[PDB]
Subunit: 343 residues, 5 copies
Amino acid sequence: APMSPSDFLDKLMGRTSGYDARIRPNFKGPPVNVTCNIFINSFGSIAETTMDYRVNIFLRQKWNDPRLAYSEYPDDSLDLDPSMLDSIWKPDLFFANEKGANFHEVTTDNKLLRIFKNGNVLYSIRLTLTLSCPMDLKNFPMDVQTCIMQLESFGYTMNDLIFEWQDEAPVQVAEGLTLPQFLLKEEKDLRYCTKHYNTGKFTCIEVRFHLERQMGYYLIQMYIPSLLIVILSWVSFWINMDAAPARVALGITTVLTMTTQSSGSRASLPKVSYVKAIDIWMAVCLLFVFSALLEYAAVNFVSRAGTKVFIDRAKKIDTISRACFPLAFLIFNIFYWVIYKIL
Amino acid sequence: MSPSDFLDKLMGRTSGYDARIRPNFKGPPVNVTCNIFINSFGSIAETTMDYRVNIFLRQKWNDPRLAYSEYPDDSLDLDPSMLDSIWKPDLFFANEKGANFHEVTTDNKLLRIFKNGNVLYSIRLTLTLSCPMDLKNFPMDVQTCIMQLESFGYTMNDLIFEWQDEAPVQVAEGLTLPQFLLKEEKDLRYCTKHYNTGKFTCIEVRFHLERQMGYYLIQMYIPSLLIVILSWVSFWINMDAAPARVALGITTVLTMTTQSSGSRASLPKVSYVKAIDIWMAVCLLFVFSALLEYAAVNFVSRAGTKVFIDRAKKIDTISRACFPLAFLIFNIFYWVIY
Amino acid sequence: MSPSDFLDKLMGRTSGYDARIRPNFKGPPVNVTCNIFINSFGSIAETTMDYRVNIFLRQKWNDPRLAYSEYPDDSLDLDPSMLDSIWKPDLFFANEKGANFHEVTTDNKLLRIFKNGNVLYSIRLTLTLSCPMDLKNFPMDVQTCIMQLESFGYTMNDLIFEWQDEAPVQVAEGLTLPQFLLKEEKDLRYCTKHYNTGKFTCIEVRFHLERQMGYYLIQMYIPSLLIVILSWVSFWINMDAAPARVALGITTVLTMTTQSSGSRASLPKVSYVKAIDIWMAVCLLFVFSALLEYAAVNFVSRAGTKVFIDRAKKIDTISRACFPLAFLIFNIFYWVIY
Amino acid sequence: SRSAPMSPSDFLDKLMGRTSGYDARIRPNFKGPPVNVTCNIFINSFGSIAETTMDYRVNIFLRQKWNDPRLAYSEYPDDSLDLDPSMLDSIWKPDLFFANEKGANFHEVTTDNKLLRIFKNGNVLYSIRLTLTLSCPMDLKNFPMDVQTCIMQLESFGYTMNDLIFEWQDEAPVQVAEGLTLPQFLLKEEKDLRYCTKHYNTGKFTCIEVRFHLERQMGYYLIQMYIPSLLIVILSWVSFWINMDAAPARVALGITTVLTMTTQSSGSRASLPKVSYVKAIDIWMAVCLLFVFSALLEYAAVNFVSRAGTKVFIDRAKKIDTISRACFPLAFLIFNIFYWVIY
Amino acid sequence: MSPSDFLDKLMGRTSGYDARIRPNFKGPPVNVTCNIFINSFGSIAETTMDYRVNIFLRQKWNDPRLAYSEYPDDSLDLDPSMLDSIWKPDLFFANEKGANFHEVTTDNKLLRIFKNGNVLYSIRLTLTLSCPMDLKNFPMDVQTCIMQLESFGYTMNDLIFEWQDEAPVQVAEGLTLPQFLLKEEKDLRYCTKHYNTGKFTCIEVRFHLERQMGYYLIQMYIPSLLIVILSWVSFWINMDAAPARVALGITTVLTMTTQSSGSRASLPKVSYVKAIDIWMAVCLLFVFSALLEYAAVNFVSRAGTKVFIDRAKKIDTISRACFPLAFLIFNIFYWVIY
Ligand SMILES: CC[C@H](C)[C@H]1O[C@]2(CC[C@@H]1C)C[C@@H]1C[C@@H](C/C=C(\C)[C@@H](O[C@H]3C[C@H](OC)[C@@H](O[C@H]4C[C@H](OC)[C@@H](O)[C@H](C)O4)[C@H](C)O3)[C@@H](C)/C=C/C=C3\CO[C@@H]4[C@H](O)C(C)=C[C@@H](C(=O)O1)[C@]34O)O2
Ligand SMILES: CC[C@H](C)[C@H]1O[C@]2(CC[C@@H]1C)C[C@@H]1C[C@@H](C/C=C(\C)[C@@H](O[C@H]3C[C@H](OC)[C@@H](O[C@H]4C[C@H](OC)[C@@H](O)[C@H](C)O4)[C@H](C)O3)[C@@H](C)/C=C/C=C3\CO[C@@H]4[C@H](O)C(C)=C[C@@H](C(=O)O1)[C@]34O)O2
Ligand SMILES: CC[C@H](C)[C@H]1O[C@]2(CC[C@@H]1C)C[C@@H]1C[C@@H](C/C=C(\C)[C@@H](O[C@H]3C[C@H](OC)[C@@H](O[C@H]4C[C@H](OC)[C@@H](O)[C@H](C)O4)[C@H](C)O3)[C@@H](C)/C=C/C=C3\CO[C@@H]4[C@H](O)C(C)=C[C@@H](C(=O)O1)[C@]34O)O2
Ligand SMILES: C[C@H]1[C@H]2C(=O)N(C)c3ccncc3[C@H]2CN1S(=O)(=O)c1ccc2c(c1)OCO2
Ligand SMILES: C[C@H]1[C@H]2C(=O)N(C)c3ccncc3[C@H]2CN1S(=O)(=O)c1ccc2c(c1)OCO2
Ligand SMILES: C[C@H]1[C@H]2C(=O)N(C)c3ccncc3[C@H]2CN1S(=O)(=O)c1ccc2c(c1)OCO2
Ligand SMILES: C[C@H]1[C@H]2C(=O)N(C)c3ccncc3[C@H]2CN1S(=O)(=O)c1ccc2c(c1)OCO2
Ligand SMILES: C[C@H]1[C@H]2C(=O)N(C)c3ccncc3[C@H]2CN1S(=O)(=O)c1ccc2c(c1)OCO2
Ligand SMILES: *[C@@H]1O[C@H](CO)[C@@H](O)[C@H](O)[C@H]1NC(C)=O
Ligand SMILES: [Cl-]
Ligand SMILES: [Zn+2]
Ligand SMILES: [Zn+2]
Ligand SMILES: [Zn+2]
Ligand SMILES: [Zn+2]
Ligand SMILES: [Zn+2]
């Protein structure tokens, strides 16, 4: 008859085992090789203001512990109760760019422990992580962001512990996982982030996600409504020059609506000190609207004396402006959209 | 037999019971029958794309090691501290963003065992669950929010989940949602997962949430009508009054833009066209056209000759009937489509 | 007898006491008498539809195993660490959204035992309780917020809750709420629950919260009067001044819409008509009619003939008396109804 | 013959450990008079004073002193001994809680922020660092020239007055960190001390109280509230120097000042709780609104009496502006004299 | 010697080691040498007057009880669970508002011991530290944020802190702050505390944060210029156009007030004059004077006599050159001062 599980666990890692979790596998020999892979269950809360993003993952860690090799059962592997994780050695993996992180204990510890005949261990744990993602917003809202995730050892130096991504499918994403503001690109870069502190040299592996911001929201809520205000400023040119309060009021309100439009769009962003692509658009839209008001300043000023010579001279400005600003604004959009579509 | 001695022999020191070993450990998978009582349902957020729920999660399964003959009682209600001593499933919620137990004034847990070794295990949980939303038809949209009950560590050969046949999901009497109607029919299905670590049991319940329309009539649709109707009073005003007709034309356009942008403030920044965007867009055309109407009236009437003053006067008389007509025709189409 | 030896024999190692067994375990249900002291009452949120409270929860019951004769004292005040050694009820709050104990500087708990085995158990708790609100009469509404004390694991045959006869709910002296008046009368009743797991004891207290009106007079009703009264000054202005009368008519309409929408910002998005919606709607009619009044005046006076200029002049003289009259008549109705 | 003094390990074991027979569940002088606990606090930080939630936050060192005869020692000549704070679990100590506490926490980084010192005669000094959010009911009648009294109640939860009594130190019970400033308030030097002895249906419990006096700084409200209101009132007066024929200009100027004043008034109430009594800022805004609203009614009169273009009425209307030009600046100055003198 | 046996003899059961006793307990104070690695630096809030940091805190000291000769290794890297078995300093952060350890996936701690008994102890911490700010020169202000490392329980005769001589504070490569520049030079000093409980070791590091100006040029200073320049176009407009010049004068004043008040929204309510208040105040004078300029032009030109119409015309011609000049002179002064 085969050995009872209770007796087996006691002899392998319990009281009678002589197993010490404070000693690493191959303790006098070469470093432990931990093979990592992650399953991304959820990806979101991508905040420009706080410059971070949230992720829910299953972190898988694989390594060999010869002390856990067994011959008592024919099974290729054994699925163990996760309470046995406290009894075995395991890597001290932490996330270097983590701002917040927690385990999941409902309804029980969200953990998995599997051991193989030859002493291989599979250790999966569910984690929620808030990771820092420094952003370059120069091309906002046509920007593309690279958010990273660093898996590092806190206490073991490179001679004792080394991390490594799986060869096949290191990062997996849940089927049908969508982000409302971004597109998560299929290609994820993998690299080493090996750290050198004054305490020594520590293993660190990295994955980089590429996030492309979706443009459609900004067309509807930012670019189209700015067009509306610029087009509105042009109706001044089809209005009678004698109607001063109407043309001025129409010129002012477009300028002020454009400033609140511009400042309101910057409300959901961090206070960076470089020029963004949306700042260029709003600046130029503000010129075209501001020029339409200066256009009437000229029309009102040259037409002071009611002599036909000046009334017609002022009339000439409106006829030119009626064609030139719509032309000049179209020329600007050609340049603008080509620059941020080509580059 | 004294309860103290009984508990010791069944699951305590003298029992030889090992909670690290599942029931029927060398045999077929443990069949866990689940049912939930929804105590509270709310915090349905479009922005963060999730909802909050307070539930009693009931789990039923058979553990032959816990069968008893010492008492005639069909079942025994045990102190929940004994839950630490017995095996139980590792149920987690796959789409959970936040979750907690309830420990006031004591652990909000229930443990009941039956003669034949059946276990009833109820626990009170608060869960924040993710609910991806399709807002194409907002605010006449209907949302499907799910809840996945999954095993983290046991594969399908060791552990299987299953909904109760009779009344798997129960809702507290008189439970109302201020923004939504929770439909009576809940879909039940399997979400069985296949990871690189293996095949894991997963069962799913889908709630159907129908957004209540009344709020948006009062705070969104009626006040937009008011601005469109306001733009039409321009057509009954004297054409000579340029500042009045222009100012009235502008303010309606700007009030309409702030109205439109303000309605999008409580929503996530999605990149598709919503039903409210169509309404505001068209309302903006009718108000913007009313201003362009005066641009025409002011332009054709430049020279004070009677021929043009009457020609300009003709535009207002047509516009007075045509925009109210055209706007009514639009509402017929709009409300019929959705 | 030394206290150390006494505690050891009553509930410790040598006692044979088992906290997993209830008092009168083979007999009738344990009668727990509850009373609460409300230390703090506030954070009453309409949006999230809940309120926060800080209380001392007192529980009284008899455990014959804790009867003593070793000391003449009527009762003994025990160190609260002994609460872990005795049986106690599993009271939870059914409508609790959040709850916590208080551990600074030590556990905020009290344990007192009496000669005959009676136990007094007081614990300080902060609770966030759900309070579904009816805002039909807002801001002249009155709200009923409840608090349910329930057993999670014991059925009615094993455990029954009951309010004290004398002063079950006590309130700290000078406790005031800035937005509400907490009425002196609190309703007490049974909320006995029937789940598929059985029948569970539940007792309930209902607080009546009357919203204070003064804030809304100053920040909502008076400023709306100001805008309505402002619209009437148009009628004392020259009819030739089109831009002035129109601009004055528009700005009052738009100020009234932002006034109306801004007042709904601190409320949940409910789909029924509130009393404040009626007021703002009617105020909007009187302001909107004042603008339509000038549309008529400007339209009938097109040709500068004396017959129409006087006919248009007649409208203003009637309107000067009729709208102030009609608005006063509306307030008579409105304030009398609510 | 001078033998070696007792080892600390053995000493702690005999005083409060295994061999001691010490029971932390029994109070000092258990069959005798009440334990006299002498309290004092050091205020490390004082802030987050919120009108809306009606509370304030404080970081303190809470010192408690009392005598436990069981902890008297003669084995060392030292007047006192500084003990590892893990020994706090082994001794009896008071059950002090803060009666008006809405939130409270200990500090465990990098170790427990606690101090335990014992004296030859059995006196104990126990200091613990706490962050507390305390409720402070506010009277805003005189806001923003209001003065607030925020209290802090130290109470026993489980011990009645016959077993436990609290008492402030005679010398310097409340100490404040040097250079501690509050941006919105001035913390007055004088702190009131008194008894808050509680009588519940569970009995009579010791309670001692400290009252802080917080005087709100006026400078912020001059710059952001009072001066900008003056600007709008002064702006309304420029109407009186404008031509009476210019109806749209005088009306538009009259309206915009009224509406700017309402948004000014409602915006100032945004950071306050929704109280149902009249505040001092409500009086100011109300009167400022009268002066601006009267300036518009002034033109209603000017426009109405001057209907027919006859010289008699045009001059009669002209007389109103000349009186108003001097009377409103006078009347507004008279109001400020009254207003600022009252508060 | 096996590691298990070695740890048992050095600090475990057979060791006789007592973590409640400090190294050199009857002798001179323990000298703890501190150094920090700044992994992250941010959340610098003016409103709450604090900042957040993520660090590795390194502590070095000698414990002769931990000296070893059993292995030739210069040092040994120990499992961090052994930290509970050894004595270590009670370092706390005096100006800490919030602080936490990091336990994912295991305790983020490092323990290394040397032959001679030296200990290296590194722990990862997130800290929210208070940073009182002087905003007199905002937004051209420079801030000094400090970090105090103090002993809570040990007086100066038992425990002394000290910064490392070489590289006490290290910063992660490529660490940038979006609003500030973290200066390379960090001041180090002693903050030794004297309470009524005694004299306690305290060492301090001061970071110098220079606020980046570019954001405020784009979102604050340039848009204010735009409104001031807009006010000047009034001077090229016909004096007969009263509603146009007044409306243009008003809207610039009101846009400037909302501009000014909106810039103060992200700041604490301090009662001293800031540099941005001076700028907005002066910008408000130039815009307010442009409106008073027309009050003069409209008033002196009452009677249509050529003498006054030209006299009023003279004011505009002077104002057209003088305000652009005077505003340029102001900017020369302003930007040179700060
Ligand atoms: C000269 C200003 C007057 C008032 C003109 O303003 C207007 C029209 C009327 C006037 C003629 C409108 C104005 C923009 C200007 C034109 C300006 C630009 C096209 C850009 O800026 C210029 C000058 C600027 O150096 C001050 C310079 O950046 C420097 C410093 C930078 O460090 C961060 C550095 O990276 C760089 C290398 O070098 C830049 C390259 O080039 C453009 C960047 C300005 C955008 C401004 C805005 C966008 O939204 C802002 C806000 O939400 C609002 C309410 C109004 C906008 C506005 O006010 O827009 C706003 O502030 O035209
Ligand atoms: C008809 C609208 C035109 C544009 C008129 O608008 C104005 C004046 C000009 C036009 C003549 C102004 C308008 C109110 C209307 C008159 C309307 C009422 C007195 C009330 O509503 C009516 C119709 C309503 O049914 C559409 C009906 O509800 C029932 C049936 C519904 O099912 C069909 C059902 O769901 C619901 C639960 O029970 C009701 C009993 O009775 C009143 C309730 C409307 C209030 C509206 C408002 C209050 O604040 C809102 C907002 O903050 C804002 C910015 C402006 C307001 C406004 O716009 O106020 C506002 O939106 O007059
Ligand atoms: C007299 C005001 C009239 C209405 C003038 O207002 C205007 C133009 C029109 C009028 C002529 C506009 C006004 C500024 C003033 C001129 C004022 C200054 C240049 C400064 O202030 C003066 C007086 C001030 O003492 C009241 C004094 O502070 C000292 C002494 C105080 O002890 C008496 C003491 O407590 C204090 C701590 O230190 C100071 C040194 O000097 C300047 C500081 C004022 C700035 C004001 C503002 C900036 O943004 C604010 C707000 O976001 C807004 C909406 C409008 C602004 C405004 O309203 O700006 C605003 O409120 O001109
Ligand atoms: C065996 C451990 C550790 C130890 O406790 N001792 C006594 C020795 C003895 C001889 N040589 C090395 C050690 C150290 C290192 N090994 S270990 O490689 O298994 C180990 C164990 C735990 C660790 C660690 C390294 O880095 C930080 O956490
Ligand atoms: C008996 C357990 C587990 C174990 O510890 N041992 C020693 C053996 C021995 C032989 N065959 C299988 C095992 C595994 C599996 N069984 S179990 O089915 O009861 C079990 C128990 C706990 C588990 C688990 C599976 O997966 C998740 O956590
Ligand atoms: C004695 C307990 C409980 C138990 O553990 N056993 C062994 C028996 C034995 C015989 N009859 C009943 C029991 C049950 C019931 N009793 S109890 O009434 O004291 C009890 C104890 C704990 C409970 C509970 C009821 O409801 C839920 O939590
Ligand atoms: C000695 C304790 C407590 C106790 O456990 N016993 C057995 C007795 C015996 C005789 N008289 C009184 C007691 C009580 C009271 N004393 S005590 O004064 O030290 C005490 C100890 C702990 C307490 C308490 C009072 O009230 C709050 O919690
Ligand atoms: C040895 C400890 C402590 C102690 O427990 N005893 C018995 C004595 C005996 C004689 N002299 C001093 C003591 C005190 C002080 N020492 S200690 O320096 O190692 C120490 C240990 C722990 C401490 C502490 C001081 O202050 C803060 O917490
Ligand atoms: C602590 O050690 C440093 C060198 O590591 C030394 O310079 C300093 O003097 C020591 N401090 C004391 C108080 O002895
Ligand atoms: Cl206007
Ligand atoms: Zn790539
Ligand atoms: Zn369905
Ligand atoms: Zn009642
Ligand atoms: Zn005082
Ligand atoms: Zn320096």
